[PDB]
């Protein structure tokens, strides 16, 4: 069966809750970087 586009786009609900969670992670990963005195990098944010 040809794959349909229907199964390859995340629902808006999951996207919004994941946006909240991921931006919380980024905020926690940036305020710490202020204290540790380094710029962020692709390595940290690849998981997000």
């Amino acid at each position: 069966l040809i794959p349909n586009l229907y199964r390859y786009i995340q629902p808006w609900e999951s996207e919004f809750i994941d946006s909240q969670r991921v931006w919380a992670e980024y905020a926690l990963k940036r305020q710490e970087a202020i204290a540790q005195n380094r710029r962020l990098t692709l390595e940290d944010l690849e998981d997000s």
């Binding site: 794959p3 349909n4 229907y6 199964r7 786009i9 995340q10 629902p11």
Partner: peptide
């Protein structure tokens, strides 16, 4: 067998949008 596209109405019993797309 035919190339005509079949409407997936009634074909969504066991599928989700986010499945097979992680």
């Amino acid at each position: 067998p035919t190339g005509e596209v079949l409407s997936l109405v009634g074909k969504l019993e066991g599928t989700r949008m986010g499945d097979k797309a992680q």
